[PDB]
Specification:
The complex is a heterotrimer of chains A (14), B (209) and C (222).
Chain A (H helix, E strand, L loop, with lengths): L14
Chain B lengths: L8 E4 L5 E6 L8 E6 L6 E4 L13 E6 L2 E6 L9 E7 L5 E3 L3 E5 L8 E5 L3 H5 L3 E10 L5 E6 L2 E2 L4 E3 L3 E2 L5 E9 L1 H5 L4 E7 L2 E7 L2
Parallel strand pairs in B: 1-9
Antiparallel strand pairs in B: 2-6, 3-4, 3-7, 5-6, 7-8, 7-9, 10-11, 11-16, 12-13, 12-17, 14-16, 15-16, 17-18
Chain C lengths: L2 E5 L3 E2 L5 E8 L6 E8 L6 E6 L5 E3 L7 E6 L4 E6 L8 E9 L11 E2 L3 E5 L8 E8 L8 E10 L5 E4 L8 E3 L3 E2 L5 E9 L10 E6 L4 E6 L3
Classes of the chains: A little secondary structure (14), B mainly beta (209), C mainly beta (222).
PDB class: immune system
Keywords: HIV, V3 loop, antibody-antigen interactions, aids, Apoptosis, Cell membrane, Cleavage on pair of basic residues, Disulfide bond, Envelope protein, Fusion protein, Glycoprotein, Host-virus interaction, Membrane, Transmembrane
Assembly: trimeric
């Protein structure tokens, strides 16, 4: 629902 | 670029609910995070992503979000909740920002009378041609004290170093006062006094060379 | 189980470079943004930056030009480098973990080190003079016997005190330090004990002043 700082270590995009 | 605005102080009575707000235009599309920091201690994460609690955090701590304002709600507030509470956020670019912090004060706490401990100069210090009287004050509330030094009933103003009181881990306060003398000054008097005044009452300790 | 330990010089001269190290134990070096955060005395927290295990960094925009963070994955250590320090850089510097993995807490710091104090000053480091405060009942208003150690004239902060190598904890009170007008710090640590227990126990205060590379174990005798 809100955007985080993703950074290099997150598979936040499924 | 953004700034997180939170009040510097919130006061509540025991059993009541404390509410701390944190606001920024950035918070409409950014998550907030809450930390509790006790005196002399690392912060503790209490709320993440606006509303979520870590496993160790009880339900009495709740986070809520409304537009550009987030709120930390603490129900059933007691003295142990006295601490600094920080809001924090991050934007997509990796600009992490903390709020200025909110000091929670619990009102109506009972008076606690000071314990006073006084040590004379050690023989080892005297051999090093120095002399320090040490007056240690602990377990008092509220956190305001006056310290007066005397030599044979006469006030001593010079050579005094005294701390501002600070919170102990039991919500009571501690302070220290040090009187510097030459070994010659130390031996020249019959007795020295550290007089500690707290809430109109005085606890005095004496030492004799 | 992740634990973080910061190490620093205690004191840095203005315009010099501040170097700090954080050692990670009790958990993986992967799946985290290893973070430096600081806090000036009596002030709020300020973000500095992170390093990921691959070496990728992220900095506070206001401090990016002066700041370098590096990681040594083999040693499970990260380092901070802050150039051209001023009095504005005097602070407790914290190492913290931002968990970065499926199921994490987002952009939060869920575990922190205890921090390392950094003073930016022209003043020189000075080790403490430690004096025993001999056991006395007449010393206190608290109805007990009291003994302790006076830790005098050190710089910068902090000194830590333990008793009998950590074996004595009950009745121990180490007081906050005073800043004397000389610019040097002093503190006292006191043990309150039943007077009858005197003579059944050896008392030694273990004074640690990391900024001066000094330790003192002082025997407190009757």
């Amino acid at each position: 629902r809100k955007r985080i700082h993703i950074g290099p270590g997150r598979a936040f995009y499924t | 670029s953004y700034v997180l605005t939170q009040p510097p102080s919130v006061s509540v009575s025991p059993g009541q609910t404390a509410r701390i707000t944190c606001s920024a235009e950035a918070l409409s599309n950014q998550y907030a995070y809450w930390y509790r920091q006790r005196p002399g201690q690392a912060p503790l994460l209490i709320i993440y992503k606006d509303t979520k609690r870590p496993s160790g955090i009880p339900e009495r701590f709740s986070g809520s979000t409304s537009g550009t304002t987030v709120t930390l709600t603490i129900s059933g507030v007691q003295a142990e909740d006295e601490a600094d509470y920080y809001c924090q956020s991050a934007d997509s670019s990796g600009d992490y920002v903390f709020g200025g912090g909110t000091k929670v004060t619990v009102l109506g706490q009972p008076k606690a009378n000071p314990t006073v401990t006084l040590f004379p100069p050690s023989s080892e210090e005297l051999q090093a041609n120095k002399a320090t009287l040490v007056c240690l004050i602990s377990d008092f509330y509220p956190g305001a004290v006056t310290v007066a030094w005397k030599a044979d009933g006469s006030p001593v103003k010079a050579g005094v170093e005294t701390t501002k009181p600070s919170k102990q881990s039991n919500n009571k306060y501690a302070a220290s006062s040090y009187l510097s003398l030459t070994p010659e000054q130390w031996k020249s008097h019959r007795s020295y006094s550290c007089q500690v005044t707290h809430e109109g009452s005085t606890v005095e300790k004496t030492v004799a060379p | 189980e992740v634990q973080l330990q910061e190490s620093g010089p205690g004191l840095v001269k203005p315009s010099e470079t501040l170097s700090l190290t954080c050692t990670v134990s009790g958990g993986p070096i992967n799946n985290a943004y290893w973070t430096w955060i600081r806090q000036p005395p009596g002030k709020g927290l300020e973000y500095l930056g992170y390093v990921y295990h691959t070496g990728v960094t992220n900095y506070n925009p206001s401090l990016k030009s002066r700041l370098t963070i590096t990681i040594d994955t083999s040693r499970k250590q990260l380092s901070l480098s802050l150039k051209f320090v001023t009095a504005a850089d005097s602070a407790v510097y914290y190492c913290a973990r931002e968990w970065a993995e499926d199921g994490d807490f987002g952009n939060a710091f869920h575990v922190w080190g205890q921090g390392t104090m950094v003073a930016v000053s022209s003043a020189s480091t000075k080790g403490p003079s430690v004096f025993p405060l001999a056991p006395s009942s007449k010393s206190t208003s608290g109805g007990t016997a009291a003994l302790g150690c006076l830790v005098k004239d050190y710089f910068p902060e902090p000194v830590t005190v333990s008793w009998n190598s950590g074996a004595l904890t009950s009745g121990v009170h180490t007081f906050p330090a005073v800043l004397q007008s000389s610019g040097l710090y002093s503190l006292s640590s006191v043990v309150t004990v039943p007077s009858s227990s005197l003579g059944t126990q050896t008392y030694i205060c273990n004074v640690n002043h990391k900024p001066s590379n000094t330790k003192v174990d002082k025997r407190v005798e009757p």
